[PDB]
Amino acid sequence: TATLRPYLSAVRATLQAALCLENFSSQVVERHNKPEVEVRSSKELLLQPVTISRNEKEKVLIEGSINSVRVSIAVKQADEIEKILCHKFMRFMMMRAENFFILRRKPVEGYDISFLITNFHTEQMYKHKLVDFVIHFMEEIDKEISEMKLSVNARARIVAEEFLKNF
Amino acid sequence: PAYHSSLMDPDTKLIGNMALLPIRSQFKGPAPRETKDTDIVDEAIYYFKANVFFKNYEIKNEADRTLIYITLYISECLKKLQKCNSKSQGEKEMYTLGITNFPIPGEPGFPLNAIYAKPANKQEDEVMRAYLQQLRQETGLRLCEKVFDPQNDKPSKWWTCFVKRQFMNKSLSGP
Amino acid sequence: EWED
Amino acid sequence: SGIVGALMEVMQKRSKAIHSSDEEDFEDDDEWED
Amino acid sequence: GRLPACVVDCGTGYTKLGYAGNTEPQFIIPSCIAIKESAKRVMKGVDDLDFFIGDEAIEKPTYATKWPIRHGIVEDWDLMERFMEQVIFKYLRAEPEDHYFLLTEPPLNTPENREYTAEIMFESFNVPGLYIAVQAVLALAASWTSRQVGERTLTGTVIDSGDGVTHVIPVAEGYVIGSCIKHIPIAGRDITYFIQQLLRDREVGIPPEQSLETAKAVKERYSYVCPDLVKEFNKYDTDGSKWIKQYTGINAISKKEFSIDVGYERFLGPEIFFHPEFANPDFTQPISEVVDEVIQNCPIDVRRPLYKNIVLSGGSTMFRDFGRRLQRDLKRTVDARLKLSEELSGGRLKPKPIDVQVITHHMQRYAVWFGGSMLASTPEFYQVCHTKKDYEEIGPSICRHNPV
Amino acid sequence: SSARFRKVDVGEYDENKFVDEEDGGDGQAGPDEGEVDSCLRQGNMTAALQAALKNPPINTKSQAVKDRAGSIVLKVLISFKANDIEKAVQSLDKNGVDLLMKYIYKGFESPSDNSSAVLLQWHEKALAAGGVGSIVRVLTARKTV
Amino acid sequence: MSLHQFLLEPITCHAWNRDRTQIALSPNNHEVHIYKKNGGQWVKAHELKEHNGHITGIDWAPKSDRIVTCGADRNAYVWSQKDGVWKPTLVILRINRAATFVKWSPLENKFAVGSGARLISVCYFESENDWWVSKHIKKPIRSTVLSLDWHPNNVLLAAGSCDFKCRVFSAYIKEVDEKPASTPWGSKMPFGQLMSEFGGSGTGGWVHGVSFSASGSRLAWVSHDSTVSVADASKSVQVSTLKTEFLPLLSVSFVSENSVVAAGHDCCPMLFNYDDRGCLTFVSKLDIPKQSRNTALETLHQNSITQVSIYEVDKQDCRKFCTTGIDGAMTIWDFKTLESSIQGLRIM
Amino acid sequence: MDSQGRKVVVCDNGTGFVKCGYAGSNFPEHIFPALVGRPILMVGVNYPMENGIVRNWDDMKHLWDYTFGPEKLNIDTRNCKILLTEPPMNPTKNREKIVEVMFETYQFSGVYVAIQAVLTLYAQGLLTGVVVDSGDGVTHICPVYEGFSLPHLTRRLDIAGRDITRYLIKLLLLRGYAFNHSADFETVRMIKEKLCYVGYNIEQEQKLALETTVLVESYTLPDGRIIKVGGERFEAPEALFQPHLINVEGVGVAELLFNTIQAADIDTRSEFYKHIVLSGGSTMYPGLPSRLERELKQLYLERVLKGDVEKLSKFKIRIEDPPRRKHMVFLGGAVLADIMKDKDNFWMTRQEYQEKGVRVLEKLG
Amino acid sequence: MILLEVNNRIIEETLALKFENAAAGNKPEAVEVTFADFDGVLYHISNPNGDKTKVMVSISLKFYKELQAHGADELLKRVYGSYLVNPESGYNVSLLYDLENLPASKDSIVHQAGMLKRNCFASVFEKYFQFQEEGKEGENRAVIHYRDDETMYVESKKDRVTVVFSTVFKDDDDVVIGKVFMQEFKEGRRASHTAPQVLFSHREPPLELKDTDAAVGDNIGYITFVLFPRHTNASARDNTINLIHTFRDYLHYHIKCSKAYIHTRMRAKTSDFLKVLNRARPDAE
Numbered sequence A: 001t002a003t004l005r006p007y008l009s010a011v012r013a014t015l016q017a018a019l020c021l022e023n024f025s026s027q028v029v030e031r032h033n034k035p036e037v038e039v040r041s042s043k044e045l046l047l048q049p050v051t052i053s054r055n056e057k058e059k060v061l062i063e064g065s066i067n068s069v070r071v072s073i074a075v076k077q078a079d080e081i082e083k084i085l086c087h088k089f090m091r092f093m094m095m096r097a098e099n100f101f102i103l104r105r106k107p108v109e110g111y112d113i114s115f116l117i118t119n120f121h122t123e124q125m126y127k128h129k130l131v132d133f134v135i136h137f138m139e140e141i142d143k144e145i146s147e148m149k150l151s152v153n154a155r156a157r158i159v160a161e162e163f164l165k166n167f
Numbered sequence B: 001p002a003y004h005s006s007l008m009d010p011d012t013k014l015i016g017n018m019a020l021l022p023i024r025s026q027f028k029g030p031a032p033r034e035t036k037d038t039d040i041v042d043e044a045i046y047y048f049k050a051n052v053f054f055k056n057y058e059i060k061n062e063a064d065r066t067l068i069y070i071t072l073y074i075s076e077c078l079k080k081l082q083k084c085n086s087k088s089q090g091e092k093e094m095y096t097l098g099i100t101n102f103p104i105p106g107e108p109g110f111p112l113n114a115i116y117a118k119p120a121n122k123q124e125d126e127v128m129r130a131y132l133q134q135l136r137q138e139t140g141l142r143l144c145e146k147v148f149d150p151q152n153d154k155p156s157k158w159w160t161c162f163v164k165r166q167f168m169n170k171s172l173s174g175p
Numbered sequence C: 001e002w003e004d
Numbered sequence D: 001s002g003i004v005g006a007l008m009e010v011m012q013k014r015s016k017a018i019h020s021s022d023e024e025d026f027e028d029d030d031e032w033e034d
Numbered sequence E: 001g002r003l004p005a006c007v008v009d010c011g012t013g014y015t016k017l018g019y020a021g022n023t024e025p026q027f028i029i030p031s032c033i034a035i036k037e038s039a040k041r042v043m044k045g046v047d048d049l050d051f052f053i054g055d056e057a058i059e060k061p062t063y064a065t066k067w068p069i070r071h072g073i074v075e076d077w078d079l080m081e082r083f084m085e086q087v088i089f090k091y092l093r094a095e096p097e098d099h100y101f102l103l104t105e106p107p108l109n110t111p112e113n114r115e116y117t118a119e120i121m122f123e124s125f126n127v128p129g130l131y132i133a134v135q136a137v138l139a140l141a142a143s144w145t146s147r148q149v150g151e152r153t154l155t156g157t158v159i160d161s162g163d164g165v166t167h168v169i170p171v172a173e174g175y176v177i178g179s180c181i182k183h184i185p186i187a188g189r190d191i192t193y194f195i196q197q198l199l200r201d202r203e204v205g206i207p208p209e210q211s212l213e214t215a216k217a218v219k220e221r222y223s224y225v226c227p228d229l230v231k232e233f234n235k236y237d238t239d240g241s242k243w244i245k246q247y248t249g250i251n252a253i254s255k256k257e258f259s260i261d262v263g264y265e266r267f268l269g270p271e272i273f274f275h276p277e278f279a280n281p282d283f284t285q286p287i288s289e290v291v292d293e294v295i296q297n298c299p300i301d302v303r304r305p306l307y308k309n310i311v312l313s314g315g316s317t318m319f320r321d322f323g324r325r326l327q328r329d330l331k332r333t334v335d336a337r338l339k340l341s342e343e344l345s346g347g348r349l350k351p352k353p354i355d356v357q358v359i360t361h362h363m364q365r366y367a368v369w370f371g372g373s374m375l376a377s378t379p380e381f382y383q384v385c386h387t388k389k390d391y392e393e394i395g396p397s398i399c400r401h402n403p404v
Numbered sequence F: 001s002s003a004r005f006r007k008v009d010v011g012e013y014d015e016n017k018f019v020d021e022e023d024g025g026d027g028q029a030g031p032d033e034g035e036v037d038s039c040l041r042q043g044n045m046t047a048a049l050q051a052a053l054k055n056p057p058i059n060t061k062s063q064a065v066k067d068r069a070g071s072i073v074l075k076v077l078i079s080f081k082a083n084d085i086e087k088a089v090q091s092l093d094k095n096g097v098d099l100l101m102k103y104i105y106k107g108f109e110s111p112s113d114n115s116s117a118v119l120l121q122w123h124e125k126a127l128a129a130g131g132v133g134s135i136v137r138v139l140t141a142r143k144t145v
Numbered sequence G: 001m002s003l004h005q006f007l008l009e010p011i012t013c014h015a016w017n018r019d020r021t022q023i024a025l026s027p028n029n030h031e032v033h034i035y036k037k038n039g040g041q042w043v044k045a046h047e048l049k050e051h052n053g054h055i056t057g058i059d060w061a062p063k064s065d066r067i068v069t070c071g072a073d074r075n076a077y078v079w080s081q082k083d084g085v086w087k088p089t090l091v092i093l094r095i096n097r098a099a100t101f102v103k104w105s106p107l108e109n110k111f112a113v114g115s116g117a118r119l120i121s122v123c124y125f126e127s128e129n130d131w132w133v134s135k136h137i138k139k140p141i142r143s144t145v146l147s148l149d150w151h152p153n154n155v156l157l158a159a160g161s162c163d164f165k166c167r168v169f170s171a172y173i174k175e176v177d178e179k180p181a182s183t184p185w186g187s188k189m190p191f192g193q194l195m196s197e198f199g200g201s202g203t204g205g206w207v208h209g210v211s212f213s214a215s216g217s218r219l220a221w222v223s224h225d226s227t228v229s230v231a232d233a234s235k236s237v238q239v240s241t242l243k244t245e246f247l248p249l250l251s252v253s254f255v256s257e258n259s260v261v262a263a264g265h266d267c268c269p270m271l272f273n274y275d276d277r278g279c280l281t282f283v284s285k286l287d288i289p290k291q292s293r294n295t296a297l298e299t300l301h302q303n304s305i306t307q308v309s310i311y312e313v314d315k316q317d318c319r320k321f322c323t324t325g326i327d328g329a330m331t332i333w334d335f336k337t338l339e340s341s342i343q344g345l346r347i348m
Numbered sequence H: 001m002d003s004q005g006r007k008v009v010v011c012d013n014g015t016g017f018v019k020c021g022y023a024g025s026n027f028p029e030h031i032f033p034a035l036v037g038r039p040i041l042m043v044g045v046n047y048p049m050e051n052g053i054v055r056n057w058d059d060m061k062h063l064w065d066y067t068f069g070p071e072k073l074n075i076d077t078r079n080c081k082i083l084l085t086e087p088p089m090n091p092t093k094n095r096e097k098i099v100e101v102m103f104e105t106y107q108f109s110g111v112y113v114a115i116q117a118v119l120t121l122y123a124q125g126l127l128t129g130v131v132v133d134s135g136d137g138v139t140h141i142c143p144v145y146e147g148f149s150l151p152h153l154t155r156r157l158d159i160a161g162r163d164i165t166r167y168l169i170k171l172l173l174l175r176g177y178a179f180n181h182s183a184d185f186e187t188v189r190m191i192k193e194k195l196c197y198v199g200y201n202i203e204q205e206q207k208l209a210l211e212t213t214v215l216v217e218s219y220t221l222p223d224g225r226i227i228k229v230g231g232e233r234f235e236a237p238e239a240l241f242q243p244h245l246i247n248v249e250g251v252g253v254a255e256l257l258f259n260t261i262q263a264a265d266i267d268t269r270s271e272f273y274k275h276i277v278l279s280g281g282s283t284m285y286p287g288l289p290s291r292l293e294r295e296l297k298q299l300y301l302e303r304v305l306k307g308d309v310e311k312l313s314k315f316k317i318r319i320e321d322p323p324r325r326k327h328m329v330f331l332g333g334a335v336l337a338d339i340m341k342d343k344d345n346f347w348m349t350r351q352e353y354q355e356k357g358v359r360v361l362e363k364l365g
Numbered sequence I: 001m002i003l004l005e006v007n008n009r010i011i012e013e014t015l016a017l018k019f020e021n022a023a024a025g026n027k028p029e030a031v032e033v034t035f036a037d038f039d040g041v042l043y044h045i046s047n048p049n050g051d052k053t054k055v056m057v058s059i060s061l062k063f064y065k066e067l068q069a070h071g072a073d074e075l076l077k078r079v080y081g082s083y084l085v086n087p088e089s090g091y092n093v094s095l096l097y098d099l100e101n102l103p104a105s106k107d108s109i110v111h112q113a114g115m116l117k118r119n120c121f122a123s124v125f126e127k128y129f130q131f132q133e134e135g136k137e138g139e140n141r142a143v144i145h146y147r148d149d150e151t152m153y154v155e156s157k158k159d160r161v162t163v164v165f166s167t168v169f170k171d172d173d174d175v176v177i178g179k180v181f182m183q184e185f186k187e188g189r190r191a192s193h194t195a196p197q198v199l200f201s202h203r204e205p206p207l208e209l210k211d212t213d214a215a216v217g218d219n220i221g222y223i224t225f226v227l228f229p230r231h232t233n234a235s236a237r238d239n240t241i242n243l244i245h246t247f248r249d250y251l252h253y254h255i256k257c258s259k260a261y262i263h264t265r266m267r268a269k270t271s272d273f274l275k276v277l278n279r280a281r282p283d284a285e
């Protein structure tokens, strides 16, 4: 909690400022309803992208529109084992993207995970619970990765111990 | 499906919606005398082991109702025949159980009161009581010969293994 | 037409 | 062609071996017809 | 030179394992897993490697037996992943990086369940290829050994039955018509419970802990299909010496012997296929009416090939006269309809009489495995497999359509 | 053959499109550098900060002017202490507050070591006498800085 | 503060009749529902279903009881009451993108529809062949129109759109209106003429809500910059802006000559003051928290308020006003109750 | 309802519905289905016509006698006036057959038979334009100049909604859900009427399909299963613009419209450009006319103007889709009956049919 | 199951069933099975010339010439005796069992027939352990290509026997997990004092293994076992041989099991996330 609490407070305040959406039909195609951060057809409906960075390798990029918000998170990876565990975890969660309802099948380049939140999710859920879910997700990922690394090391110790014992 | 009777004749006397079929008996009363070997009691005893597993029965004619009545009373005969020890005591128990005042159609306590039709006239009530009593006594006397294994004179396992089964989830007596 |  | 013709060919080869490998209380037939 | 592929068929009751190119499976095991009791989770050390599968999983002290597959559909994917570890590395003893694999699926399977199976095979065992096969086509292909050359086609009706529900699967030109599939709730676990209720009322001396597997041993040895019920009851009472058989067994806890009499349950067991109201109080429709209803919901031009080719499969179709009873009751059901259309129209509807033929072959017991074994021995099997290179580049969307 | 007609898009060649209301103007060269350097020379911190918040380069369409203007205000923003941040926050007015939010949110984009964490400290004090609407005015602005 | 959970779904818009006994809400689909108050309960009444799209705007006239509905299916209907049943009548719009907002005229002869095809449709009634004829106001509008309001002399119109500007047009049809008098906004008023174009150059946001006054000489609009601004036409046509520290607001209305009530994504209505010299000052939040894991925000609404409408008579004198939200509610606030409950709150 | 007192009945002989109405009415008096259900020959599943071609005339006599009976009209068969219609690319022999039926079996006093494009344009109120009409099987493009159709310029396309339904069956089969083609035609037709739409820029549509899950939704089958629809919502109606997906050689509907509208008179091209009218059951997808606007903009950019970017700005396109899509042919028939009603020689009479024989239709054409 | 086992299941089950049906007195039944094992070994159990009273078990190896150079035939003859016959075509070693002439106890011969691959491998181990026991030094090392890409080296010194495995990991995840496992194999001496010494090298051959065709790719690791006379004396040596011919497959087995455990943990966490989203509904739960 050396820099984690002000980083999470800044991400929470920026996500509170960003998630203010409403319904909007398309003004170029007759009776269409599309997220404006993905289509990017009109320039007046887009907002400026913002970035919050804890250090050189941890960052959150937030882009907004009139009816859609895209949030990209880069996760701290210190070793090779944490890198491959993070890559396996993100691939595992993005294959099941139809049950999460707010997840992208492919992340934005340069980042690890990406959320896409439209106005239908803000009509179907509370906003502050969605913000607390994003903060809770960012908190839980690192604890899960560290627990997997400790479990792999303990399993390797017991597996080596049995084979060298059995001689 | 379930097995039905085939003794229906175009000039057969009817009582309510029953068929007043002739039997071979020495008990006195309104049943006509039967010349052939096959009557309704022998057909009911012949079809009892196949018919008792069925839970749905469809009425086709008037012989089916008295077939269902003898099929139920064979089961209430077997529930008393399970506890017996000799053939003569079984015959005495059938002579006891034959004169028991079982309920008729129309009275409360009859299970299939919707399918059956109640009688109207008082002499019709009297001859229906007489006909049901003589059917009960004759099928008790005929079942007591077949239930007993003769070399040991104890009730057989093959007839007393059908105690817990009920025809159409119905019982002529209360639980 | 639209003086006033 | 395809996998279907090869599957027919391999069980055509096999069925002569299966039929050569196999080379009274329920003999009543007269009831079974209608 | 080339190693043969591995064929694995998973079911509710039994799992069948072997290599391709063989007539019989090498292993038939019960489909159960016994794990250590939770007694309260964190698994410090190798505590998920302490389990037993198969026949040694049944009745082990301080272990809980669990059944991961229910009605053909996998319920727990953690137990199914640990089930395939001991299949590959203990029983088959195959290196999974060198062998192609063939697996089977239930006939009504979601595409989401098909992607969960390929996640386990490609990312946890690193197989070079995988093919997930429809059970109806392989059971249809295994009946070509009995028939000769001219009638080897791929149109028919497949009746599959064992330890679950009984499916009636129509198939035309190698493609399953999935709109017309109907199922029966009676299968081989329901005959076993029906025999156990009949043996409990009559016989005495059976141990209470052994009442289930003595009912299973009576069914596999002494049961058959009677053609008529009331004639069969008359045969047993008049001549009891011919038909009543004796079964003996040994007690587990005392090593003593017990003997019982097997009577009316030899033919009352398989009769609940044709009279399901004997045991199940909710289903009243016989199997000969459901096979007629499935064909009548098919298109018109394919109905007459579907009547001519009815293929039985499964372990519960192994009774003595299952094919002759089903052929006789189907011909009464059609001729009830063909008489009723003729008399209502005044003789106007006069079609040709159809031919109904139920096909019984030798390999009915392992028909799904035998058809999958012959397919994997062909040289063209390796060109219809999903390789690991396509899974890394394209992704898990390739394992959603299985070409025939 | 023909199907290269699907290659060319005509949606940005329409006459009816949202062109910006770019009113042309210049004369923005940062605040200035010399009195900011002399204010850092004289042992003070506040007068350099209100020197730095004057004259934003909002109108010029030049990357280098915005780069040096975002260099000099960050160059004073690392050079502080820990307990003077609240005094430097409440010594300003609201226009200084949301311009400081614009410069802080521009300063997160190029991280360089512990200085980035220093900006996080500024962020919570700039949410003290500020609001969520300061971050909203950062998010929807047609003239970046 | 009387909540009533009508739904568990969002409500797009609502309207009241003259007696304040019926409401006309839309439960986020292709249907319009009417509710009737009796005893202490709200009972569902006659339902309206003609749109195959999604209804975005509903308005009810105070007199003659005609209900106009417009939606995302590029169509507009006028519903009239006869013998217990409501019957629709088609309005041709000659539109090709969408329809986003609708409001009746104060004298109930025209109605104005905003649209996503960068124009405003003014529709009037033709009884010579019995339909509704539309006219278009196009130039200069370069974006999607979001909010409309009618001046109280049946001529001028105020429009806020997505091109960061609020502008006042003069919609005047010669067949259905008389000759207008002079206004402080302008003197020459033909059809489609722009009178003024206020807006923030440089920085700016989408204008969500506009409102006129009872006198008709003051205009107010809110934006997505969390800013509220009041333009006065009498004081040489000047503008006064105010930047708030809260979340952006979606709906606004003058509640008097010198007081304005707004609401939005903060879930709480707020009050602002405008003196005669010209200064927009924040006064107080109207929903004070009560002196008393579940989140349980200390606000009577649990989600964003999208509409504020007056409930007691008209804009000349207000004592009650109403709000609808995305959580699904209808809250009636009282000024005399909020006067005694909050110390220092002085409504003018 | 003229000075002769004869009733004027406008009847549209559609594929699925036959409408019985009168002049001056926005809605007809009777809307009855044209289904003859045999009780294995009552009327009100034998169909007398399919795709605009009569295959059986006795079932026309049965259905038309059902219209002449007391249930629907009970009009005078000897002395009344009626209005008929006929689809484009119809053979003239069938027109000779139906005027033989009207003036021999029934002997009407006034019969006019015309083209539904002209009646749809008169329902719109505009005299000159082009009509793109698509139902089942056959799609017409028909230009109408002044008040008559041009036979040399009208064209046909074989792709319509049954091929879109079969392509949707193919994409749902490659998705993973098993459908028989013959048994499940109607439920996939219900899927096509429920969820399908036309994309605008196809690379943005496939990137939105591959990258995010905002297009998915759910549908419930009648047995109880629930399916999820991916990018196939825009994949099924893409066969009209790319015919090589359905393996039918030719060009798209936009190139057919451009090749029709360019090979004409030079002065007519402008009012053919501003006036395009869509009608039919297949032209009901949300998102459709903006795609045709982009296609005609791209084709006029590359073909005519070669490479001049600025000359695209001086080009006017208006695909006029009606917001009301209802029985428009009957509306045009009512308008055409209201304008014309006193002018009696525009109709053909029975007296002309004995005094001229079969060439009264040659005088009509 | 932590340790892999050395007995094949299919051979033991099939021969036990045939021997029980032969001892029961029933007539025999025909059998024809073909199957595989680890490291590309082929087995065939069949009847010679259609005779149903005799069974024959044949094993095919891809590297039987190198094992024949070190003398596996005398070891197989000394183990089996009269059951060893001439091999059939396409197979290396064949054994014949007659159902008419059988011993009284059908337990030792089935267990010896299950260990056919082990008895093929054990000859080079016994020869180099005998070279270490006799004290002779200066003989050449043994190179055995037990797989296509993997190569095994056996060398004998004056006081120790060195066994070098060269292993290839297909995927980079397996490279990282195998480095994690062999780090614990390398420093695991501190638990048990009497143990063979394990050394590990990544991407490079060891310096003793020089002037050979050793691969230097990034997916190739080298594992060195150092064995002492406590392990290579006779009364232990068989057990040592058993463990060492499992070893590589054993290592790869545990790597795959580690990945399976990770999958279980991810499933649990994914379920918890969905429950949080189910609490975000406005009374739709």
Ligand SMILES: Nc1ncnc2c1ncn2[C@@H]1O[C@H](COP(=O)(O)OP(=O)(O)OP(=O)(O)O)[C@@H](O)[C@H]1O
Residues within 6 Å of the ligand: E009, E010, E011, E012, E013, E014, E015, E160, E161, E162, E163, E164, E188, E189, E216, E219, E220, E314, E315, E316, E317, E318, E319, E365, E368
């Ligand atoms: N004659 C018989 N021989 C063998 N099994 C029989 C026989 N009659 C009944 N069965 C029953 O067959 C069942 C096993 O059948 P089967 O192997 O086809 O099942 P399954 O593994 O569930 O099948 P599937 O592979 O189709 O999912 C057992 O429960 C057994 O009691």
Ligand SMILES: Nc1ncnc2c1ncn2[C@@H]1O[C@H](COP(=O)(O)OP(=O)(O)OP(=O)(O)O)[C@@H](O)[C@H]1O
Residues within 6 Å of the ligand: H014, H015, H016, H017, H051, H052, H134, H135, H136, H161, H162, H189, H192, H193, H194, H280, H281, H282, H284, H285
């Ligand atoms: N709302 C809809 N969206 C999409 N397709 C539709 C819709 N309604 C109908 N269709 C399709 O339109 C076709 C039928 O349209 P139409 O009513 O023109 O038919 P028709 O009367 O048979 O045709 P025609 O008059 O050309 O002979 C079918 O393919 C049907 O699936």
Ligand SMILES: [Mg+2]
Residues within 6 Å of the ligand: E011, E012, E013, E161, E162, E163, E164
């Ligand atoms: Mg099964």
Ligand SMILES: [Mg+2]
Residues within 6 Å of the ligand: H015, H135, H136, H280, H281
């Ligand atoms: Mg049509």
